[PDB]
Every structure is written in C-alpha cells, then in structure tokens.
Amino acid sequence: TNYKPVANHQYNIEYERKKKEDGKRARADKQHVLDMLFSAFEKHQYYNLKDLVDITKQPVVYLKEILKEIGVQNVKGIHKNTWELKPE
Amino acid sequence: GYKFGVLAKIVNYMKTRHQRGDTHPLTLDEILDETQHLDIGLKQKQWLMTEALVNNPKIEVIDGKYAFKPKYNVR
Amino acid sequence: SGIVPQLQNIVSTVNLGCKLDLKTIALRARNAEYNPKRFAAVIMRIREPRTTALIFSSGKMVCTGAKSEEQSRLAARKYARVVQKLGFPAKFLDFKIQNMVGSCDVKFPIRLEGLVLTHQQFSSYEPELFPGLIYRMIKPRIVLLIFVSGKVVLTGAKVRAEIYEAFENIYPILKGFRK
Amino acid sequence: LSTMIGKGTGAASFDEFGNSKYQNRRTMSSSDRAMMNAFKEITTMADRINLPRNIVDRTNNLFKQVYEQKSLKGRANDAIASACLYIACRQEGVPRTFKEICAVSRISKKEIGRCFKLILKALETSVDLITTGDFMSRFCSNLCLPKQVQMAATHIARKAVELDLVPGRSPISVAAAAIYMASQASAEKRTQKEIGDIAGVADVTIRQSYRLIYPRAPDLFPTDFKFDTPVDKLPQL
Amino acid sequence: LKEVRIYAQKFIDRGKDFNLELAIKTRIISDGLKYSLATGNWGDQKKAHQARAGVSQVLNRLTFASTLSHLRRLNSPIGRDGKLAKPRQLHNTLWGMVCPAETPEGHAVGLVKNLALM
Amino acid sequence: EDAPPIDLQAPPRYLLKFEQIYLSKPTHWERDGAPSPMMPNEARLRNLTYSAPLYVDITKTVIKEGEEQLQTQHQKTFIGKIPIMLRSTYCLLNGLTDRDLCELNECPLDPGGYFIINGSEKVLIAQEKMATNTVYVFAKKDSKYAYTGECRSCLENSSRPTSTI
Amino acid sequence: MAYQLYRNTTLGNSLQESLDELIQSQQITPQLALQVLLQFDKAINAALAQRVRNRVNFRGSLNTYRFCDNVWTFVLNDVEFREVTELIKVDKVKIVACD
Amino acid sequence: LRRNEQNGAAAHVIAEDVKLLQFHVATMVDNELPGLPRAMQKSGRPLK
Amino acid sequence: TVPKLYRSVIEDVINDVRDIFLDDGVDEQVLMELKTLWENKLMGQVEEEPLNSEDDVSDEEGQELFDTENVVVCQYDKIHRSKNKWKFHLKDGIMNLNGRDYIFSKAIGDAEW
C-alpha cells in the first residue's frame, strides 16, 4: 500500500491550484506604486527587498526599476546590502 | 505609517516639476496641494521646513521659498 | 486519395504598428477582457467571423479561430478597426499566418502499434500520455495526430499546401496499417 | 579528485576559540555538484519501488547524457531524473507506469511525461511499446494473486489485444481489467478499487475496459483454467 | 528523522504541504545496517576512523565445530596490536563462563575467547 | 518510540509521530517489481542480503492557526530493510520442522545465528566491554593520581553513548 | 474608498439624492455626504451577505461582455429568471460583477 | 591563492588560503603531524 | 419581504454613521432629517494600410450609455466559459428588475454567445 501510483501528489495540486487562484502579480502604474512605496517607508526606516516586494505586491523587476530611480542601496557589513527608500 | 513618507512624494513631485522646466521656487503649502498632502500633519510641516528642505543637497532656499539645485548638477 | 483535410483553426499574427493602452481598450471595447494577473494581453472575440484575438500593449495582435485564410485576414482587419475606432493609430502591418490546424478521417481503423514500429524515427505512441499517435513529418514540418478511430489532425502548417501535402504523404502509410 | 581534511586531534588543530582552523572547503564543480545530487535522487526513487541497481546504473548513464547534451537545461533536474528512471525501466524490459514513477518522485506525471519525450529526442533513442504483459507480474504479485490467476490475466489481456476488443485503450487499463476478470474467475477475488490502487487506474476505467472484454470472456480465458466462479456467472458491469 | 525534518522544512518554508513518503529516505537504514555488517567497520562509513573493526566476520565453514565455535566467539576490548599479559591471562572468573582451553595462538592469545558449553 | 516527535513551524505547524513498527518476512524483489519471500539459500547463491522490510505507523497532525486540527495516519510506512539473523524469530526458517528445512535446501543441523549480507554469511562477534553504571576504583602506579574511581554511566535502553566520570 | 457597487441603484440613488438636498440647504458639508455613502456601502455589503439565504437561477443569451480591474459588465438578452417560488421574464439585463 | 592576489581579495581571505596551502604542502610530506588534522582520502582513510 | 429587509438596512446604516457624526462634530439632528427625506424619495487590396474598405462592422454603442433597462449588480465566485456558453457562479447580490428589487444569495446562470 506504499507509494501507490498517482498522476499528481495531493500537496502539489493544492499548491498549483493556490498559485493559479492567486494569479501572477500585475504591474501597476508607477504613481500608485510610489504612493504605496513611500507609505511603507513610514512604518520602518529600512526595508528588505524580499519583504518590500510583499508589501508592494509588484513584480520584482518592475519594483527594482522604480526603486532604482529613487531608492538607493546601502551596504551593511553586519548582514548584507539592502535598499534605502529615502531618495537622498 | 506617518511622519516619514510624505516627504518622498514632495521630492519626486519637485523633481518632475523641474524636468518640466519650472525653475521658479515653490512654497511648502503649494507643493503639498499638487501632491495630495493637504492632510499632512502639523509637526510634519515644521520638520520639512526645518530639516528636510535644507539638509538635502537638491533643495535650494531662495527668497524663503524652495527651488531645485540644477547649478550643482552638471547640465 | 480522394480525401482533403478541412482546416479547423488558423493562427495569424499582425502588427498594428502602434503601442496600445490595454486598460483603455478593455473599458471601451465591446467584448474585450483584460486580466493582467492572469494574462498580459487583451482577449477579444467577434462572433460573425467566429474568431478570438489577443491584443498586446506593444501593438502586435494574434488572431485565432479562423477556418480559412480569408477569414483570418478579414477577422484580423476587423479587430484592428475596432482598436482604430477607439482612437489609436492601428494599422495592418506584416500580416502573417502562423499556424493552420486541419482535421480529417481516413474512414478505417488504424493499427497504431504497427505504424510506430515501421516509423519509429518519426512516430511517438505513448498511450499513457496521449491515446493518439504523434507523427512528426520532416519534408513538410507538420505534426500529425493519428488515432485508432481513423481521425487524423494536422497542425503547424504555414500554408494550406502543407496540410494537403502532409496528408497525401501519410495516407499511403496509413493504408498499409489498415485494421 | 580531492582529499578532505580530517577532524582535529590536538590543541594546535583548533583556533584560539574552539572552532577548528582547518575546515573542509566546497571545491566541487557546480555541474558535478548538480549531477551528484541527481544521482542521489535517482537512487532514492529507485529504493522506494525496490528497483535493482542495474536499472539505477542505466538511469545514471541516461541522466549524464541528457545533462551533458543540455537540451533539457530548462527543466528541473528531478524531472529529468524521474524521466530518465522511467526510460531506464523501459529499456531494461521492466516498464513502470508514469504514475508509479510519479509516486516515488515529487515531480508530477505530466512533467515526467514531458521530460520523457524531450530525453528521447535529445538522445535520438526510442523505447519499445509497452504491452499488457509488461505489468502482469508486478500488478498480480502486489495484489497477491496466485500464479494461475496471473497466467489467466496475462492470457486474457494478450488475447483481448490480439482480438482488438479494446482498441485505443491504454495497456495498463487493459491489464487492470484483465486482472479483474481473472481475479473474479478464481477464489482470490479483488475489487476494482483494489486493482486500481495497485494498477494506478481509476475504477471507472477498469469498468469500461472490463465491459469491452466481458462479452467474449470464455474465448479470452486459458483453456486449462479452473473456474471457481463459472465464466457465465462472471460480474456483468 | 534528520532528513525528514530537512526535507519537510523546505516544503513547509515554501508554503506547500509535504508528502511524508517522499520525505523518508529508505537508504539510511537499509544501507547503514548492511554496510556495518558487510564490512565489519562498526559505526559510520564516514567516521570509520573511530569505528570498531572486526565486529562482523565471515562465518567459518571449514568444519561444523569451527562454525559452532565462530558463533560463540568472544572478543576482548584490548587491541590485538597492543601487548599486555593481564588481559591475556586466564582469569579465575572465566570458570564455567569461558572455555579455559580454546584461545588462538599468536597475537590474540587470551584476547579471543569462546563461551563455555552451558 | 523514544524518538521525539518532529515539529515543523515555518503559520502552519506540522507534527510527526512514529507510532508502531512492523516487520515482514525477508523479501526479494525481482527486476519486474514482484516481491517474493527470500530463502536463505537463494540469498547465498544470488549474493542477496537477507533482509526484512521495515514499516512504521506515522501520524501527521497539522495546526493551521485557524483553531482546526487535521490528523492523518500513514499506516505501515516503509522506512528501510533490516538484515535478519537466520533461524531467529523473524527468519523464514523459524518454526520449520527438520523436514521443512530440507525442502528449502537448508541443513537442519545449521544453527543459524548469522546474517547473509551480499551472500556472505556474517557473524557478529560478542564484543567485551567494562560494565557500565558501576563504580570501579583502580590504582595507577605511574600516573599523578594515587587512585582513580571511574564510572561509565549510560542511559537506560542505551541512549546517547556512555558518559564516563 | 470602498467597493462602491450599490451606489448606482434605487437604494443608492435615493441616498445620494437626499444628501444633495441637505447640501443645497448648507445643513451638511460635502465631506459629510461622502462619509455617509461610505458607511452605507459597508452596511449594505454586510447586510446582503448575512441576512440573505435564498438561492436563485436564471437562463438567457449573452450579447456582450467585458472585464477590467476584476469587474465584469455582462449584457444578457432574453433572460429567464427562474426561481422555485416564481419565474420572472425580462427582455434584456446587464449583470455587473466585482471581486 | 593566485587568483585572489590578482583579484585583490581581502587580506583575511588570502590568509585563510595560505593556511590551507601550508597544510596541504605539509601533509604532502608528513601526514602524521602531531595535534593536527589528518588528510583523508574522501573515505576516512588517511593519506599516505 | 423586501421592504422589511430595507428597514433593517436603515437601522444598520444609522447605527454605522453615529460614530462618524460624532467624529466630525456635526449635530445628531442631521441624521434624523436625512432619514425622513430618504424614505420619501424612495416611495485585390495590395496596399492594406487603409481600413476604410470595411464599414458598418460594429453595433449600436448606446446599450451601455442608456442603462435604463434592468441592471443587476452582484459578486462573482466563479465565471467559466467553454467555447459557446458562459457560466456564472454569482454570490449574494442585488437586482433591479422592472423597478422591483430582488435579493439572492446563490445564483447560477448559463448564457449563449
């Protein structure tokens, strides 16, 4: 009764269904992302790119492009270089 | 949150306004009007007027008002 | 042979030569549906041609569902006019037919087991994955789905000549494995 | 080829604060490291379904060619390993079903089947078509059917295919129906759910294939078969 | 269980459930038990430096008595290379427990022993 | 049983507990996948390892923070193969009359007590060691200590290896 | 700043019209009227979800459809709203959906 | 080590490399160094 | 039945706005006046660039412009379509059919295109 033949694993169809139901992140307009981007900066002075993506819910490439124009990367030797939401 | 994000929109709107060729200085209240920041808090207003708009290297204090700094930038 | 495949679907891509605003098109277009989370194009359907077309922000459009070359071009032009009627400078540039799908029946059962043995270099029969034999013709680059019931589906043709030429080549082969 | 530094023994081997100053360094190539992990995955899958080491060795060779050929570089290594394991079983004359390979692999059946087609194209090789008799020994042994019932099922499926009573049916579906027919005609009777679970075939599919061969049941059975249940009284469904 | 935790950690981290069967590596117990008996190196193959050797030996089939003797053999902790008379001596306490006569001649005198009959 | 339950947390929380152990007869799998009982003589001739499949019952409980607990048990999960000592309670030859052993090409006088690993009959030699948990006082003539009382303390059921004081 | 669906309905239209009358009389500032509409949308949305437990069925023909920002704008012709208690006929209906 | 010098890597990175080079060179001649790790053959057997 | 549901909505609406009316400092008398008015109101072309060769390839655009016909506003759980037909798993919502207001919780709809 072990390793019974199966077309797809139950854990895999659920994850596939969840990904399909959620759908891919859409590329929103720059103005809305900027407004949401700066509102996030208010809560925390420093933000990680991986965590920042979740707040913005935007594609990584699109978020980086908009963040690159205004945001800058500050190198921290303690952990790693992260992004700065302050334009200056 | 609050007290740290409205400034970025002011800077970006200021940068975009300069790109249009408007070198004239703009008041804090005037810039707030076009950035949808009419509800900006009072203690935020003073902080911008005292620290943000002077410490930044892209803000020029001219006749009291604030204007871009294209002179420092190479044009 | 006496049997001519009948086209079931044609895929044609045409460039409108102008960037388009997908959100604006969806709001104003009659049948357009835009779901950026799902797909990055605008899906529109017109009933009289009975075809579906996808519109991208780059201005390139893909038309599918046409049953003939004339229908595909006519359907594609109609879609371009709809976008043009929305205020965009849509044009009809480098219209091309990308794929032609044809289906037919040989009117006799086929022994797919024998066919794959004699044509293992071109055939691929996997009952677990698909109940129909997949034949990849080389001289015309046409992929044929041969079934035990005799139904044959041709796809990947750029012109109607390939569809007929491909069937003419495979029909004698199928006749040799008649069941 | 390389040597690993052993564990420290004296105080000179350890840094000023505990940790050893001479520590092993990862000097393995990325290509070799990935290939090493795939072989580990290939052996893990094989042990799950008790495949002999010769099939694993054939799978490892298949993966190396595909990995070096680099036509499947876009696909996950586990899917390539799973597809190579499937191909190795076919090449050795003991095919496993795509579902059986998927059970021992995190990769789904669809992705194994897709990599399987690409690997054949990349290797310019082919696999002989599976027959109903390629699964009888494993399916019947797993169902705990006697040799006589296994022989009856093997004959029924082979005769049914020859008589073309199940055209276009998957060989696994035919075999499961034949096992059900043979099982119901002997003392050891197995339900459709039981046979489907081992065969990886939905009981509906067994019912459909069985219904096609049921009309000619007496012809399919071996002549020297002792019917615990007479062929006339076999289930009609 | 270490690899079951490691495997399940990767899937749970990604937010998807994990298949329990795919988490289990059956080679760990099958090969680990087989290797120790196959080679006699007692412990882990990677840690063979500290692994006790000679625990597993090919059964002697020269004679039936030799076969029986090999199944009742006792190995002393003292290393064969090391030399020390006291562990090799026939201690009083071996009466009725260990054969006072059966012992190999050479480096293993007194170190390899055989159970008394009862 | 003594193994701690595996707790996963990274939010949903997964618990795994290994309940009960099952052992089947020494089985051999043909290349086609059909299992069959492995006779010791076949293991010797074909260089097989005389091993019994090992199965464990595993209970998987998941807590999703929604105040709902889902518990599923994976009965008899294969976790590996244990080599079997011949003529032991779990060997195929166990409980076979001398006549039955001859039918299997096995010598009735053969005492068992050994393993067949890759067809090689392997015997584990009894390893002699100092008793644990007992206080022993010894005198070292050369060492800096006049006397030394040691105790090799080990957990019940022989858990993490002996600790000496 | 909410879903804002039922504003363009008989219930929504009446509420909007009433606020206009007060505004013309200077009784309520324009900001207050927006807040009242916002609160109404929250109440109606919750009201429909909880206190409505009746199922309906309908059939017809679709003439046009649209989709944007998770908003459908179906246009059905000759719809037949069929219910266990009663049947309702209509020449044309527009179904607007959101999520 | 040569690449690190050419690439101008950090001093501590080079120092760790020099430590390994000293160990490998030393255990190429004598692999029974007292109070030092042994060079194994990827299988637990010390190198000769 | 529907009027009774409308009355319950009024109670929720007035209650939900009491806190807001206190936040802005407006007198509570405004709410009482609002309800009174609200109740009363209810009761061979080788050169293909020119597309002008085809005309009248559209329909009247005033269907959505008018919107005077019955309009249904609701929420969708699932919306599936298979090459001819549109299926609608519309959840709780509202309908405006011939002026009369209809309320539903589960709605199933099949349409042909």
Q: How far is CA F23 from CA F2, F51, F122, H30, in A?
A: 18, 10, 21, 50
Structural domain includes residue A46: yes
Q: Pick from B18, B5, B9: which is nearest to B58 by CA?
A: B18
Q: Say if strands F120-124 and E56-58 run parallel, antiparallel, or are unpaired.
A: antiparallel
- Can you give D9-37 as a three-state secondary structure string? CCHHHECCCCCECCCCCCCCCHHHHHHHH
* Residues of chain D numbered 48-107 and touching chain C (CB < 8 Å): 97-98
Q: Give Rg (Cα) of chain B.
A: 12
Q: Is C169 annotated as a binding residue?
A: no
Calpha distance D126→D87 (Å, rounded): 9
Judge I/G contact: 3 or more CB pairs < 8 A. yes
Q: Say if strands G55-64 and G71-82 run parallel, antiparallel, or are unpaired.
A: antiparallel
For residue C177, what are the contacts with CB-CB under 8 A and spacing of at least 6?
Answer: C110, C111, C112, C114, C115, C118
Calpha distance E67→E71 (Å, rounded): 7
Cβ pair D199, C128 in contact under 8 A: no
Using the Cβ of D4 and the Cβ atoms of chain E, whether some distance falls under 8 Å is answered with: no
Binding-site residues on chain D for chain F (CB distance < 8 A): 48-52, 54-55, 92, 94, 96, 137-138, 140-142
Question: What number of other Cβ atoms are within 10 A of residue E98's Cβ?
Answer: 19
- Burial code (b: 16+ CB inside 10 Å, e: under 16) for H11-42 equals eeeeebbeeeeebeeebeeebebeebbbbbee
Run of H or E including D107 = none
Q: Say if strands F126-127 and E73-75 run parallel, antiparallel, or are unpaired.
A: parallel
Annotate A9-61 with DSSP letters as a single string.
-HHHHHHHHHHHHH-PPP---HHHHHHHHHHHHHH-SSB-HHHHHHHHT--HH
User: Where among D126, D157, D181 does a domain terminate?
Assistant: D126
The partner residues of I113 in beta bridges, in order of sequence, read none
The partner residues of C103 in beta bridges, in order of sequence, read C6, C153
E21/chain F closest Cα distance in angstroms: 7
Q: Please name the residue of chain G whose CA is at the shortest distance from the CA of residue I26.
A: G28
Range of the domain at D228: 127-234
**B47 Rama sector, left if φ>0, alpha if ψ -120 to 50, beta otherwise:** alpha
Q: Pick from C90, C103, C94, C102: which is nearest to C73 by CA?
A: C94
Q: What phi and psi values does residue D139 have, to the nearest 5 degrees? A: -65, -45
Question: What number of other Cβ atoms are within 10 A of residue C99's Cβ?
Answer: 14
Q: Where do runs of H (alpha helix) occur along E15-101?
A: 20-23, 27-39, 64-71, 85-88
Show contacts of G65-69: CB within 8 Å, 24+ apart.
Answer: G65/C31, G65/C33, G65/I86, G65/I113, G66/C26, G66/C27, G66/C29, G66/C30, G66/C31, G66/C32, G66/C33, G67/C26, G67/C32, G67/C33, G67/C34, G67/C35, G68/C23, G68/C26, G68/C27, G68/C33, G68/C34, G69/C23
Angle, helices D30-48 vs D53-69, to 10°: value is 150
Calpha distance H47→H31 (Å, rounded): 7
Q: Which amino acid is at F46?
A: R
Cβ pair A63, B33 in contact under 8 A: no
Inter-chain touch D44–E30, beta carbons under 8 Å: no
Calpha distance E42→E55 (Å, rounded): 7
Tokens at B41, concatenated:
């808090």
Annotate I24-72 with DSSP letters as a single string.
TT--THHHHHHHHHHHHHH---SS----TTS---S--THHHHH--SEEE
Structural domain includes residue A10: no
Domain ranges of chain C: 1-11+98-179, 12-97
Q: Which amino acid is at D43?
A: T
Cβ pair F108, F102 in contact under 8 A: yes
Residue pointed to by tokens 């060769």: I53
Cβ pair C163, C7 in contact under 8 A: yes
CATH of residue A78's domain is: 1.10.10.10
Structural domain includes residue A29: yes
Q: Pick from I93, I104, I75: which is nearest to G99 by CA?
A: I75
**How many distinct structural domains can be found in chain D?**
2
Structural domain includes residue A30: yes
Residues making up the binding site of A for DNA: 77, 79
Inter-chain touch A10–E17, beta carbons under 8 Å: yes
**How many distinct structural domains can be found in chain A?**
1
Tokens at C130, concatenated:
């698909």
Using the Cβ of A43 and the Cβ atoms of chain C, whether some distance falls under 8 Å is answered with: no
Cβ pair D9, H36 in contact under 8 A: yes
For residue E54, what are the contacts with CB-CB under 8 A and spacing of at least 6?
Answer: E40, E75, F125
Chain G partners of C29 at a C-beta cutoff of 8 Å? Answer: 66
Chain A partners of D48 at a C-beta cutoff of 8 Å? Answer: 2-3
Inter-chain touch H37–D4, beta carbons under 8 Å: no
∠ Cα D183 D187 D190 (to 5°): 40
Q: Are residues D45 and D101 in the same domain?
A: yes
Cβ pair I22, I39 in contact under 8 A: no
Range of the domain at A54: 22-84
Tokens at D236, concatenated:
């009609």
Calpha distance G42→G6 (Å, rounded): 10
